Structure 1
Amino acid sequence: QKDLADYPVKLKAYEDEQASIKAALAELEKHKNEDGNLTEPSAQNLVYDLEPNANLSLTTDGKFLKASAVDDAFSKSTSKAKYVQKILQLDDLDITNLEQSNDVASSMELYGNFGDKAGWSTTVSNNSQVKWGSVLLERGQSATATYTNLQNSYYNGKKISKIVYKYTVDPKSKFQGQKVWLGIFTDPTLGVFASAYTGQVEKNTSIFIKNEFTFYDEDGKPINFDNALLSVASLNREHNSIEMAKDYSGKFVKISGSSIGEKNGMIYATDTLNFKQGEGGSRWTMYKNSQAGSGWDSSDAPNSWYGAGAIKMSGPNNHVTVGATSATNVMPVSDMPVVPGKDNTDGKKPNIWYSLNGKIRAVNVPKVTKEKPTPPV
């Protein structure tokens, strides 16, 4: 029991941080209504934002797609142009070329910018290497992803060894067609890419994916969260499209000054668009350009909180539905923001890229890193 010799420094590191966090919250209490601050000051006991080397395993009641089939689909149709430039434009992939019988594989196969495409870039993280498994699902069908051997994730300083996510295609999705391509990245924090895009934009459509997740400790036991913060970011809203989260467990917490809020049980840019500065009330342009504050929509943007919020969750099993839907499916045209020269009725691609991790976008959120050491017996 050399524990009694190490316990002294362990308890101090804990108590130090613990006290350091308490003081930080009391300090944030007067800045909670300032831009980028969580309206409800709170610490993040869930460290979950970096897992580039995690292992991925999938099962599905749908169909696995051969990696070669995914590669061919990328080289054809609407993604062809970008393909020739050595770019994997996921939001342009025509799902049509993944619906043939000869595309189905018996097991999971990874694809991405790494094989003979190590140099290539993708729309998920430019040149950084990225890998994903692919399935073809119909409404109600799903894929269950098991992420193992993580190395940077912790809950209350307790190491997270495994995460099991179940992705289900919401039957109420209105996209035309019966199929959806799901690309699940090996790095659980990158999330997934869901698409029913068959080459043409669609009106009054949507694509919603239900997300059920359980995090496990080093003993393989589900982790019973106690107000952990889940990041709901990149909730884009253009004049004709709204990305939102709904049907979720836990409580929504707003980030002061963010365009994201909660209305009628849905989390999205409730009162303005957030695509282009000056358009539809948007404060900043989502993509990087000449104007200050632009490019807010990235994981590292200092003002990414503009299109983000958070959910305080507890319990061993949690869930949230994320998707993109035509603005018309959410409210009457006469109640929408007006952008001269743009038709709020325009169809959109029924696809989406999203993730659910612990990288809360609010500013100065104190992190819990030290676990409370238990007195040796």
Structure 2
Amino acid sequence: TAVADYQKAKAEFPQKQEQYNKDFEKYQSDVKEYEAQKAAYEQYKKEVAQGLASGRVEKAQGLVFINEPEAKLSIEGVNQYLTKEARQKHATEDILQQYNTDNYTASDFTQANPYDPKEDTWFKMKVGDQISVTYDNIVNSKYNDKKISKVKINYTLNSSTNNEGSALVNLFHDPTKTIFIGAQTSNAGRNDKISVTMQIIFYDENGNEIDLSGNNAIMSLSSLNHWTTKYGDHVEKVNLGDNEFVKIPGSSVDLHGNEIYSAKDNQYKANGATFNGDGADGWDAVNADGTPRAATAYYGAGAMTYKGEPFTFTVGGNDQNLPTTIWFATNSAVAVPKDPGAKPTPPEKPE
């Protein structure tokens, strides 16, 4: 028994030290992350408490526009819907290949919408051609206690990364999930981009457009990834136009001119990021509904006071042949720093 115990402890000890080593490196990593989250949270709590500009996220928010799972689509200005057959044919493909516009041909598109208003719709957008999407059956949303009955979003593709002046769009029937857009990156040199200008109009129950001049419509501009690898210097940017930037404390995202983005890589700790974006517990992890999985989502986020005026998102920087994609969603779910909990404690040294 003493022998059994002894030989087991001896035999297991190498493994226990291996695991200890792993757990300690994790602890050291976790503490840097914890300190960062804690710093961001404390600054956020201060800004809310003291009424600094970033506190407007909690103090000025009159918009509730986060979950509209019953919304249905009415679309004007789209000429090239993806056929159901083509959608089906690409549904098993990896996301990048799904948005590789080189893998679609003209026979994959039709001028007649095959999608029910109640379902996510796929189409090719064309550079310069504004589309107008009306979303109604809006059940959960309001602005300053005006129930929202309908939302209209205009979208305009300004440029693409492909050489066809086009991008493939998955348009969510839920307007709070917005748009998933992508195209092949046809050219080398990382200087092409997908750029979409949008404008969102909310309507009240009487069908009138809602005046946002009370500056209570705080909208998320989350998941502005910037990664830099051998495969690209991929940067997601928003030009806020006449809307106002709301800085998220601790965020990698800041104002550079009238564009917001992360000036440095915010995707890989290996590239200097505070948090990794990738994986099920990376800062950029999302549910199918687009809702962040991660308390650290603030890190790749900004926000805006949305004044009802156009804004433009852009993504670009991929190397040639790596399709450029962005799920761009804006809604009232601003990603702010959250309570990181207890400081992680070092693991017990096995002895």
Aligned equivalent of 2:328: 354
Report the Cα distance in structure 1 between the residues aligned to 2:96 and 2:72, rounded to whole angstroms: 22
Identify which of 276, 296, 314 aligns with 2:268.
276
Distance 2:71 2:271 in 1: 40
Residue 43 of structure 1 is matched in structure 2 by 60
What is the deviation of 1:155? 0.6
1:258 maps to 2:251: yes
Superimposed CA distance per residue, residues 114-144 of structure 1 (whole angstroms, 9 cap, x where no aligned partner)? xxxxxxxxxxxxxxxx941122222102321
**CA contact under 8 A between 1:60 and 1:135: conserved in structure 2?**
no
* Deviation digits for residues 231-256 of structure 1 (CA, Å, limit 9, x no counterpart): 10000000111001015231101011
Q: Identify if the C-alpha distance between structure 1 residues 220 and 102 changes in structure 2 by more than 3 Å, giving closer, same or farther.
A: same
**For residues 67 and 105 of structure 1, do their structure 2 counterparts lie closer, same or farther at Cα, with a shift above 3 Å needed?**
farther
**What amino acid is aligned across from residue 220 of structure 2 in structure 1?**
S
Q: Does residue 172 of structure 2 align to residue 185 of structure 1?
A: yes
- Alignment partners' CA distance in 2, 1:304 and 1:177: 34
Paired with 2:66 and 2:156, the residues of 1 have a C-alpha distance of 23
- Residues 1:196 and 2:183 are matched in the alignment: yes
**Within 5 Å, which residues of 2 pair with 1:281-360?**
281-288=272-279, 294-298=282-286, 299-314=292-307, 317-326=308-317, 348-360=322-334
The aligned amino acid for 1:326 is: G
Q: Distance in 2 between matches of 1:259 and 1:29?
A: 14
CA distance in 1, matches of 2:157, 2:163: 14
Contact conserved, 1:235 with 1:269, CA < 8 A, in 2? yes
For the residues of structure 1 that align with 2:320 and 2:110, how far apart are their CA atoms?
34
Question: Please, which runs of 5 or more residues in structure 2 have no aligned partner?
Answer: 1-41, 287-291, 339-351
Deviates more, 1:178-187 or 1:218-227: 178-187
Q: Which moved more, 1:259-268 or 1:189-198?
A: 189-198
Identity %: 27
Indicate conservation of the 8 Å contact 1:241/1:348, yes or no.
no
Larger radius of gyration: 2
Q: Per the alignment, do residues 110 and 275 of structure 1 end up closer, same or farther by CA in structure 2, a change over 3 Å counting?
A: farther
Per the alignment, do residues 33 and 105 of structure 1 end up closer, same or farther by CA in structure 2, a change over 3 Å counting? Answer: same
- The alignment partner of 2:102 has SS state of helix
1:66 equivalent in structure 2: 83
Structure 2 CA distance, aligned partners of 1:306 and 1:223? 31
1:235 aligns with 2:224: yes
Shift of 1:300: 3.6
* Higher share in helix: 2
The Cα shift of 1:200 comes to 8.9
* Aligned match of 2:152: 164
Residues of 1 paired with 2:186 and 2:256: CA distance? 32
**Counterpart AA for 1:104:** T
Q: Deviations over 1:191-235 (max 9, x none)?
A: 111122279987332111111111000000000012110110000
Q: Secondary structure at the match of 1:141?
A: coil
**1:28 deviation in Å?**
8.7
- Give me the whole-angstrom Cα distance separating, in 2, the residues matched to 1:260 and 1:91: 28
Query: Structure 2 matches for 1:113-152, cutoff 5 A?
Result: 131-152=119-140
User: 1:50 is aligned with what amino acid?
Assistant: N
Aligned residue type for 1:287: D
**Alignment size in residue pairs:** 282
Instruction: Tell me the amino acid that sits aligned with residue 330 of structure 2.
Output: L
Q: Secondary structure at the match of 2:120?
A: strand
* Maintained 8 Å contact 2:99/2:323: no
- Map of 1:209 onto structure 2: 196
CA deviation after TM superposition for structure 1 residue 56, in Å: 1.3
Shift, 1:301, TM fit: 1.6
Q: Quick one: distance in 1 between partners of 2:322 and 2:277?
A: 17
Rounded to whole Å, the distance in 1 between the matches of 2:134 and 2:254 is 31
Counterpart AA for 1:133: T
TM-score, with length taken from structure 2: 0.71
State the AA in 1 paired with 2:235: I
3-state SS in 2 of match to 1:145: strand
Provide the residue aligned with 1:335 in structure 2.
none
CA 1:294 to 1:74, structure 2 compared with 1: closer, same or farther past 3 Å? closer
Distance 1:47 1:138, change over 3 A: same
Report how far residue 60 of structure 1 moved: 1.6
Using the TM superposition, give the Cα deviation of residue 39 of structure 1 relative to its aligned residue in structure 2, in angstroms: 2.8
Deviation at 1:145, TM superposition (A): 1.0
Which amino acid in structure 2 is aligned with residue 187 of structure 1?
A: D
Q: Alpha carbon RMSD of aligned pairs, Å?
A: 3.0
Amino acid at match of 1:253: V
User: Is 1:57 equivalent to 2:74 in the alignment?
Assistant: yes
Q: Quote the residue 2:143 is aligned against.
A: 155
1:31 and 2:20 correspond: no
User: What displacement does 1:61 show?
Assistant: 4.6
Task: Give the Å deviation of 1:106.
Answer: 1.3
- Provide the C-alpha distance between the structure 2 equivalents of 1:273 and 1:67, rounded to a whole number of angstroms: 37
